[PDB]
């Protein structure tokens, strides 16, 4: 049960069955997917990115570590990904608003997580997805690779051929929710505390981008947008 590919191993672990590498995969997943969204929605210019490949056929733009500002955002995502190891990250989302600091959003790319116990089988515990995704089993490393490919392809398709262009003026933001399991002394570096998250217009539309299911974790990628 392992992926064999020089291209895949450049960005992802070839094995995701064990807890550590299942978590490590989630970290790289957060990085790759949210880099692609930042670029394909033209939130950041192409200079902040570098060309990467998920497959010898599929390419994506990842945040560069040469550029200081892009490096900073990468560490921000890395810090949120590191929270998955302890199971302290409930959801991380890229949130776009008309003005800086607004609670109500116009576009949201949410990644919600589920942590499994006892061999990565049993989910630890409302959201429409949870019931379905909690019942989803680990089906091997190759299935995970297929899920990752699907998500990246759906992101690029959604952002370039489905969603309308973002308005001329906006503020893009990364916002996350902590797990109840997370203790009061734990804080994810780069994220200032807040009693407010983000909200949605009642008429806003939603689309399911995809899901991820490595060994001991699960992720549900979703998109809310007025541009839809």
């Amino acid at each position: 049960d392992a992926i064999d590919d020089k291209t895949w191993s450049k960005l992802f672990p070839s094995i995701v069955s064990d807890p550590d590498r299942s978590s490590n995969f989630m970290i790289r997943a957060i990085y790759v997917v949210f880099s692609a969204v930042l670029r394909q929605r033209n939130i950041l210019e192409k200079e902040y990115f570098s060309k990467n490949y998920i497959t010898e056929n599929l390419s994506c733009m990842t945040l560069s570590f040469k550029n200081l500002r892009a490096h900073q955002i990468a560490q921000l995502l890395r810090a949120a990904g590191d929270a998955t190891k302890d199971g302290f990250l409930k959801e991380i989302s890229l949130v776009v608003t008309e003005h800086d600091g607004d609670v109500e959003a116009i576009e949201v790319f949410s990644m919600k997580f589920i942590y499994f116990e006892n061999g990565g089988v049993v989910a630890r515990l409302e959201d429409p997805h949870f019931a379905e995704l909690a019942q989803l089993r680990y089906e091997g490393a190759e299935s995970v690779r297929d899920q990752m490919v699907t998500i990246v392809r759906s992101v690029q398709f959604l952002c370039t051929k489905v969603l309308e262009p973002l308005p001329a003026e906006f503020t893009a933001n990364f916002r996350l929710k902590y797990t109840n399991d997370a203790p009061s002394n734990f804080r994810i570096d780069g994220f200032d505390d807040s009693s407010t998250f983000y909200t949605l217009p009642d008429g806003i539309q939603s689309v399911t981008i995809g899901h991820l299911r490595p060994g001991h974790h699960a992720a549900h990628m979703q998109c809310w947008s007025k541009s839809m």
Binding site: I43, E169, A172, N173, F174, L176, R187, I188, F191, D193
Partner: peptide, 14 residues
């Protein structure tokens, strides 16, 4: 420091 709020937000691109 100690944290009570369930949410965390970052910078921040306009």
């Amino acid at each position: 420091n100690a944290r009570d709020s369930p949410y965390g937000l970052s910078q921040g691109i306009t």
